[PDB]
Design a binder for this molecule. Structure first.
Ligand SMILES: C[C@@H]1CCO[C@H]2Cn3cc(C(=O)NCc4ccc(F)cc4F)c(=O)c(O)c3C(=O)N12
Ligand SMILES: C[C@@H]1CCO[C@H]2Cn3cc(C(=O)NCc4ccc(F)cc4F)c(=O)c(O)c3C(=O)N12
Ligand SMILES: [Mg+2]
Ligand SMILES: [Mg+2]
Ligand SMILES: [Mg+2]
Ligand SMILES: [Mg+2]
Ligand SMILES: [Zn+2]
Ligand SMILES: [Zn+2]
Lengths: 66, 47, 261, 242, 261, 47, 66, 242
DNA sequence: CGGGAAAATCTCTAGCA
DNA sequence: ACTGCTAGAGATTTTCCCG
DNA sequence: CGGGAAAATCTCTAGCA
DNA sequence: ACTGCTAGAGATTTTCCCG
């Protein structure tokens, strides 16, 4: 039930930026999604990121590649 | 308070000092002679 | 430094020497010379060296008009994905910009449009078009094209592709549609090696799926957390850390000094 | 890895597809695809119908994505080959169109339309479109008073049909359905690409005869030998390209 | 990949897909797809992302004309130091550019002048002026202002100072001379915290002194070095390393496998 | 040999391929239809 | 004689750049000066640098400051 | 550090200046300056003369740097205050002019010239210039045939005098001499700045009474106590600002 | 050896038009 | 065969100064 | 564990006008 | 109260592949 939904939401990849860094960070794991904020885990570091700085997808290619 | 000197719109002449109303990431909102203006932080200096 | 300061300000009033010059010439600490400079209105001639970052929410599109071979091309880009829609229009008017916007809103979930202050984008007709389609209108700071960096860059890319394929079409409109096709489906790169069309499909489908999944999770996972405070709503737990939202303020706290009820 | 036998048993018992086995048993999609294709007893997204309708003396050219019900429509000045080719090139630029179904009309059999289809890689073949023309006409009659010109009303109707009208099993709009279907097609194409990439490799393990390579993991190699799937360590097997 | 390649080139001829697009769509190695792109003439639309570096020998000056309040300002900068000389001229002509250059050569050791291809700088009169004063003339690649980055940047700085002090002078020529004064002596910074005037004096004096000192050293220190070759002239020794010049080729070799005679 | 594609002078249209005669740091010298041209490396691609 | 001239020439400071680096390096010590090349020591590393990429001075301020 | 006693002995024996002691004995310039100023028995670069000469009915305004012999000259349209002020502002922008010596002429006592001097910080005071006018006239007569206009010939003469004519003890040109003199003046001003910065500090060592601070080195502190210079370790002394 | 404050180095921008 | 640079604003890192 | 080759990440640029 | 970006060229670093 809940655990399946949780692992499904953590399968998504998040690309994001910090307020003063124009470079896009690597794919971080999605933990929670809100209206204005997204909560991610990037290299064992839990970061809260505004929705306007986050690109969330799946990356079908990797979901097929295993 | 803060002093803001700024370049507004295609006018090379820097103006100010203006009262700082709001500082965001990328832009600032200022008041200069009762004329509220929105200026990118690239075009303003806050002192 | 009273004598040194006064001789410095007199020098600055005439020459406007920078803080290094007064510090060397008048044996002043760097703070004092920088104070003399900073207190001079005529020496405030440069802004901070930085660049902002434009919104990339899944619903924002950036629209602009570009010009090629004497014609007007209306261009829209989905900021999150880089997927573009372009059309040649006979004139930069609010009527046809509104028509383009109605079509776009009917084909994709457009929540917000970000434009410069061109008269076509600020027209009453476009405002009515956005209101009926439920699209929020955002206007850049005037004469700041950087606020439209995405669409402005897409104008360059679109014109670049048009030049490449301009010889396979007699009319410019056909070449523009060919270039739009090439950009959306025949150029791969970016954050997932996607084409723009694949990327926008992924972005929109992912938004829908994540919304549904998080709705189910919040329906099932209903807990209140006390840390250090009030009954903060539980968002996520695990790996020795707990994410909570206390009074519309999302913060990350360790599992220690926190209890989930 | 460990769940391959469980997936085989589940597929034999319930005739499940590869997606279900991959999702439930945490297996790579290629292994589940091999499992689903190993049994003989267990054996659209780019199709559009194009037609012209007439309304108030004006020609409305309508495109329907068959799988989802999604609609692309605009008033065109005349029912000629040039406007049809322009509209179809537009559509091919916006969505991944592979095949168009038409009614052998004059504007659909023109050389301009055939040239556009050849350029965009669209395959031309000469009842959904009729019912959807009826539905679009209904929505247009509903929202005609909100616009002076017919084209604006048509685009309002397209917007309403694609996003405001919901139905079916899940109560989804047409736009949601088309997005989901295209995402599934993207997944299928990615899986096919990876299968094509890996099917040219042969693995010698423990040496035993060549075996079909299925997955090259971080800690194991999944192979198929004599219509059976075996997991072997990476250091115990050699992978070569034939 | 013979079938995959051929389908890729046919796709590229129509759409000009980038190497990623063909590699994904046609299961090609990155090298093959990049080969298809690189072999397409119409896809060669961008140069390498780099910037050269302009000469900063002690004798090079960069000259340019700028325009302010309807007048012409001829500007020269000593590249090594940033020291500038400017003068208002009534017209961009070879006569007065040559006169400015004669004055500059009479005041400072000008060995080389680097200009864009403005008609005044390419004039016959300026060529005669340089020939009599023994000044080598260097012309930038046409329509490449980056080749004059130093003087072009100085144009910005000079205009910036002129605006600051424009109200203390009635005429523009007086303001230009005031701005030149301020830049050369009232602004400190750069590689030594110098003003531009101090820096140019240091550069020129250091050049003279180093020339004399090295002349004396080479007069005294006359040795030939064999390493690994021929009798390479000795340049410098110490700290376990020897610097030699073998057939007009200066190279650094360790003290080992080298003998000084 | 090398193929050079280049932008010469205020003309946005890229031209080539031209024969590479000389490669320096910052600029290249090329021959295109017997017309020797000097192009900054910012405005050329050598293949 | 020679040693005094050598130490005098090594008192000079050299500012320089590499062929693909627009930033100016710190003050390196001058070892030898030629018509087209200068030989420097920067952080116990002997580098040959073209004359057109080298700014050589003394820095009077440090020669007074000791 | 170790050579302070040797420098003191050398200065007492030979009345040497601080530059010689610093160069020969590897001492910081401040310590040598203190040594040279400690004995009572041992006790220009910004001065220019400005004058107008007449030639071929045209006015030539000449500037001579007294210390070096360096010449700045140009033909001016008229002998008025405006042109003199413009020329002097030019010169002050090019070289560090502190004082100008003139002949109390009408163009030199004008309010415009005084205002220019006040703006540039030049001090006005009302035989080198005469001889140098003669020399410039000689060079102009030598190179007059090489130009049509008098101003170009004057600038050629200025170039020749400053860089092609060499003389004196070292056989140097005027430009070399002015560059050397200005460099020496820069050195003197830097030394004065550092002396002014350090003279406000007092040092307590080993505690003993306050002593004048001379140098704050990486491994030692040089102080002057009771008209004598002593080297003490940094950790053995405390430096405070008064 | 330890923080704090000032100095130094570093990062980045507009304008030169 | 020739070539981006400069200097100011703000951030971040070293150095130094007294314990 | 060791190099080599390919993949991935990184650095930087023009143009959008 | 809002905001440079994109994608290609060339360089440099990781990862992987067989020993
Ligand atoms: C008629 C002559 C002869 C041939 O070409 C023209 C045109 N031109 C154009 C610029 C210019 O575009 N400056 C902006 C800029 C851009 C980038 C950069 F790195 C440096 C910069 F200064 C000049 O400055 C300039 O002096 C000229 C000029 O003199 N001429
Ligand atoms: C009449 C409307 C209303 C108000 O202002 C004008 C003028 N304008 C000027 C540019 C422009 O300068 N592009 C070059 C550029 C420079 C920097 C950057 F980061 C991005 C860039 F694209 C545009 O692109 C543009 O669309 C307009 C426009 O539409 N208008
Ligand atoms: Mg616009
Ligand atoms: Mg634009
Ligand atoms: Mg020019
Ligand atoms: Mg210029
Ligand atoms: Zn000021
Ligand atoms: Zn191509």
């Amino acid at each position: 039930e809940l655990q399946k939904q949780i692992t499904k939401i953590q399968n998504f990849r998040v690309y994001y930026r910090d307020s003063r860094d124009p470079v896009w960070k690597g794919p971080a794991k999605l933990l929670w999604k809100g209206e204005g904020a997204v909560v991610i885990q990037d290299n064992s570091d839990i970061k809260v990121v505004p929705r306007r700085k986050a690109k969330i997808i799946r990356d079908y290619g990797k979901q097929m590649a295993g | 308070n803060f002093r803001v000197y700024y370049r507004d719109s295609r006018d090379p002449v820097w103006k100010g000092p203006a009262k700082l109303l709001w500082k965001g990431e990328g832009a600032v909102v200022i008041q200069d002679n009762s004329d509220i203006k929105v200026v990118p932080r690239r075009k303003a200096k806050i002192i | 430094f009273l004598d040194g300061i006064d001789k410095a300000q007199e020098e600055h009033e005439k020459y406007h020497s920078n803080w290094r010059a007064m510090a060397s010439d008048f044996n002043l600490p760097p703070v004092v010379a920088k104070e003399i400079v900073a207190s001079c209105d005529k020496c405030q001639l440069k802004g901070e060296a930085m660049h902002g970052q434009v919104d990339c929410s899944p619903g924002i599109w950036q629209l602009d008009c570009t010009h090629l071979e004497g014609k007007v091309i209306l261009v829209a880009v989905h900021v999150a994905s880089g997927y573009i829609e372009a059309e040649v229009i006979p004139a930069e008017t609010g009527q046809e910009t509104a028509y383009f916007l109605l079509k776009l809103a009917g084909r994709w979930p457009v929540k917000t449009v970000h434009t410069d202050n061109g008269s076509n984008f600020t027209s009453t007709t476009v405002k009515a078009a956005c209101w009926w389609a439920g699209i929020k209108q955002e206007f850049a700071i005037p004469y700041n094209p950087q606020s439209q960096g995405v669409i402005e860059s897409m104008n360059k890319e679109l014109k670049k592709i048009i030049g490449q394929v301009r010889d396979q079409a007699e009319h410019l409109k056909t070449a523009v549609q060919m270039a739009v096709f090439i950009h959306n489906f025949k150029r791969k790169g970016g954050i997932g090696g996607y084409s723009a069309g694949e990327r926008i499909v992924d972005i929109i489908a992912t938004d829908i799926q994540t919304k549904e999944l998080q709705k189910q999770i919040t329906k099932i996972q209903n807990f209140r957390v006390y840390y250090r405070k009030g009954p903060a709503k539980l968002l996520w737990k695990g790996e020795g850390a707990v994410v909570i939202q206390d009074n519309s303020d999302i913060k990350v706290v360790p599992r220690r000094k926190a209890k989930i009820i």
